[PDB]
Amino acid sequence: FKTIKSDEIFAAAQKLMPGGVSSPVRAFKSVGGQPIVFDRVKDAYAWDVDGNRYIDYVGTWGPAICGHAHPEVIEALKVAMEKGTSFGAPCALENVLAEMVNDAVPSIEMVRFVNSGTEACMAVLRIMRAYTGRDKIIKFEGCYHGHADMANTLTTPYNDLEAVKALFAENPGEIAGVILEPIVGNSGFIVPDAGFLEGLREITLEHDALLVFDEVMTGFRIAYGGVQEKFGVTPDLTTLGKIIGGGLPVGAYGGKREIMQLVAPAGPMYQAGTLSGNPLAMTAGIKTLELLRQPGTYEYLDQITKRLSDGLLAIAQETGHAACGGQVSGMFGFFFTEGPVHNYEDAKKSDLQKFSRFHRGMLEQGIYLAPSQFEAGFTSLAHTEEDIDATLAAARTVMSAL
Amino acid sequence: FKTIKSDEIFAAAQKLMPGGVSSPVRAFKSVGGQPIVFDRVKDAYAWDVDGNRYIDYVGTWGPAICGHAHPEVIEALKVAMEKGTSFGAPCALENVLAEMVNDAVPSIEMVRFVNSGTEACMAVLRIMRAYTGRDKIIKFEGNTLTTPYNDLEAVKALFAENPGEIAGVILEPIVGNSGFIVPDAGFLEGLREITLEHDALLVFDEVMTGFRIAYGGVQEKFGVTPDLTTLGKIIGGGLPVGAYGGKREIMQLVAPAGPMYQAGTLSGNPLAMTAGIKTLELLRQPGTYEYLDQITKRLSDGLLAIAQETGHAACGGQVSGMFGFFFTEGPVHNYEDAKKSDLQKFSRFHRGMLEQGIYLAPSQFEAGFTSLAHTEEDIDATLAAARTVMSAL
Numbered sequence A: 001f002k003t004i005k006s007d008e009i010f011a012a013a014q015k016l017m018p019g020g021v022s023s024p025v026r027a028f029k030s031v032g033g034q035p036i037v038f039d040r041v042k043d044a045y046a047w048d049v050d051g052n053r054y055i056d057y058v059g060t061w062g063p064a065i066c067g068h069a070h071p072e073v074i075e076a077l078k079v080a081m082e083k084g085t086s087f088g089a090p091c092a093l094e095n096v097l098a099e100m101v102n103d104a105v106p107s108i109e110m111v112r113f114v115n116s117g118t119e120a121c122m123a124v125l126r127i128m129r130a131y132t133g134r135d136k137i138i139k140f141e142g143c144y145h146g147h148a149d150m151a152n153t154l155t156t157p158y159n160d161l162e163a164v165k166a167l168f169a170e171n172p173g174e175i176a177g178v179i180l181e182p183i184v185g186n187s188g189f190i191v192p193d194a195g196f197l198e199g200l201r202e203i204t205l206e207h208d209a210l211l212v213f214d215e216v217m218t219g220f221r222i223a224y225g226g227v228q229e230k231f232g233v234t235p236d237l238t239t240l241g242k243i244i245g246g247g248l249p250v251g252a253y254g255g256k257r258e259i260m261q262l263v264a265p266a267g268p269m270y271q272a273g274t275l276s277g278n279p280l281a282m283t284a285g286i287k288t289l290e291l292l293r294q295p296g297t298y299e300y301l302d303q304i305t306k307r308l309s310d311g312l313l314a315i316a317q318e319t320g321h322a323a324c325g326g327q328v329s330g331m332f333g334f335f336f337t338e339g340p341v342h343n344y345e346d347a348k349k350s351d352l353q354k355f356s357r358f359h360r361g362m363l364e365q366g367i368y369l370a371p372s373q374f375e376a377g378f379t380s381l382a383h384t385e386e387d388i389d390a391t392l393a394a395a396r397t398v399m400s401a402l
Numbered sequence B: 001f002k003t004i005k006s007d008e009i010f011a012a013a014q015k016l017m018p019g020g021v022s023s024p025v026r027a028f029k030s031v032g033g034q035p036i037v038f039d040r041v042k043d044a045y046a047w048d049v050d051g052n053r054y055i056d057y058v059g060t061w062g063p064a065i066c067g068h069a070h071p072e073v074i075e076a077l078k079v080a081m082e083k084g085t086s087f088g089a090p091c092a093l094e095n096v097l098a099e100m101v102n103d104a105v106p107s108i109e110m111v112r113f114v115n116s117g118t119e120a121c122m123a124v125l126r127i128m129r130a131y132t133g134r135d136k137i138i139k140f141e142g143n144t145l146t147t148p149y150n151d152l153e154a155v156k157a158l159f160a161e162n163p164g165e166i167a168g169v170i171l172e173p174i175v176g177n178s179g180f181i182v183p184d185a186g187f188l189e190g191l192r193e194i195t196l197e198h199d200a201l202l203v204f205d206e207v208m209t210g211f212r213i214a215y216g217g218v219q220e221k222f223g224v225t226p227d228l229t230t231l232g233k234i235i236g237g238g239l240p241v242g243a244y245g246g247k248r249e250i251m252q253l254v255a256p257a258g259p260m261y262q263a264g265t266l267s268g269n270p271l272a273m274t275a276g277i278k279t280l281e282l283l284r285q286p287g288t289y290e291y292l293d294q295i296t297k298r299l300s301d302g303l304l305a306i307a308q309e310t311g312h313a314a315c316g317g318q319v320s321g322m323f324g325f326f327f328t329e330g331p332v333h334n335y336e337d338a339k340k341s342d343l344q345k346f347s348r349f350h351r352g353m354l355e356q357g358i359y360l361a362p363s364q365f366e367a368g369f370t371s372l373a374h375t376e377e378d379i380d381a382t383l384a385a386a387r388t389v390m391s392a393l
Helices: A004-013 A071-081 A092-104 A117-132 A161-170 A196-206 A226-230 A279-292 A297-318 A352-364 A385-400 B004-013 B071-081 B092-104 B117-132 B152-161 B187-197 B217-221 B270-283 B288-309 B343-355 B376-391
Strands: A038-042 A045-048 A053-056 A110-114 A136-140 A153-156 A175-180 A210-214 A237-241 A251-255 A324-328 A331-335 B038-042 B045-048 B053-056 B110-114 B136-140 B144-147 B166-171 B201-205 B228-232 B242-246 B315-319 B322-326
Touching (some): A004 B092, A071 A279, A071 B071, A092 A110, A092 A279, A110 A117, A196 A210, A210 A226, B092 B242, B092 B270, B110 B117, B144 B152, B270 B288, B288 B315, B288 B322, B288 B376
Parallel strands (some): A175 A210, B136 B144, B136 B166
Antiparallel strands (some): A045 A053, A237 A251, B045 B053
């Protein structure tokens, strides 16, 4: 297992960019220290600059749900770019993607496209405060909503309704609303307990506060309508990203019409994006959603991912390793702790030392997993039953050691 | 001049998105409210959904400096996308662009790529505070302290009023967001001196000026080096991109190198890097910036000469392929002056130009842009249209 070229490229990168990456997690410092430089990706695979091929479970963090470089998405992009890469003015593609999104997400009646999950969460934090006239916002420890700066931020344990109620009591008429990942993926994979989302919906309504779902990662993955549709709980606002861009930089935030009306130039809340509604980004997103509309899509994702997760758990047992995990559609998690995992605190009980060795072993078996214990794993419509079998055979080999 | 399809599309848009647009300025509010919907762009032109062709002076706000849909940029993108549109991991292209950006910009010794000018400025404001340990920042009109652009005395005053509290000063070395406004002689130098004097950072927002005013931007053009600068647009070839860099030791604070957290799941996108690398290479060809200054100087002068002959009060100016034209006698030194402009006249002017086949920024407070694709004839035709429109008004 050679990674010479990656080391060469990474070494050079450290003198050009901070830590030699465009995003901190890529630096592998939490699972080793020596990341692998990608050359190309296709379907369920990615290839090293050294020629090593991997069965990918990162899917560039969520967008590649139809597989890397889907022929139809690429063909669509080829045609679209002949028309120019950016307009800086309105184009019909924006209407189409917006209409598709409104039809897909229960809470979305009006949308605004931006360029990243960060920009979307940033903008939604502002409509929240602008609309309610209140400044404090409630978020959960472990949840990630971009690197937007945000004393006005109250935090609480994920899956803790009583902690949420307490914050409202301690801050009467000061809570603009509650924002969260209806299903966590940024502190490992964590599903909401029975009644948690509903409860959040009940208390926010009770206090005229907004319920905001960050579905940047779960949107169009957990279900076409995302978690909100899947679990039948409708927020007032929700953010989107990744998948709706089909690989290109994209983001979006929308929800109830009367709230979105505050967004400029409709309303006073100023939010701008010079290259927003990018025609290439719109094209890939549209094609990606149409593909997701085909028959058996989500059934297939759940099918192969449930088998993956279970197998991973069965193998940990057989090999004598404590572990817990779970999966909903094509999103899963695997922790090295007996758990169960209900919040970030639990998740951190994981044997990070072991995960590190496990991650590297898997790498040597040609499997590419998220370089961190606190990241959900992803599957795609391109992953074959064989890819799942191969991933499990690899898991056994690696865990049989450890 | 029919705009039926644009009207239908924009009408439908308002029931789907806030104001029927992705960015406020596209709504044409300050110029009639009847935006035109683009279908495609090429070279120096843009085409309506109604089939109307325009000589474009917006260039999607700066990225199209080598022309719209340049054959070599598109070819490079086609070739790159066979390898995937996004990795979520390091790729060689990042090193290539990062290195080219370092070589090009005087103050940048280390860069971090992001996905927008917004993310970059957002990150730079954070390194400023993180690095100085101070919370207040000075910006210019047009924890936040503001002052009139081109007012060194107003800036000195803020420092005296907040001893040891100013992390630094951030600005567009050349203004384009409140109309085109050049820095008066000694201004940028002055800012450099006072920031240095108070151990405060000097930050240049060259998202719009970078690689346009000059390969090295305004900081290179005017010989004034900041400690940190943000980039965008052009380095992306049209695709969403952004970047911030500067002194090595300051950038070391950026995660994972340092404690200041800033992330971008899709940052360093291979398609954006490819298009950015190809655009910079094209700009490295012979006579590029001399060409931009040549046609843009003629355009601006003619625009001013025409206003004169038609009896309209106006002022403007241009540096490289960036210009401004205000309907006020000026001169314009700051936003306050810019606001004396006859917006009512501008609107009528902007529409009449649209009718003559010329697409200008739908706002008096936006700089104009030219590209290597604009030919002498396009400039001729633009001035000829300028006269027709201003002969009326």
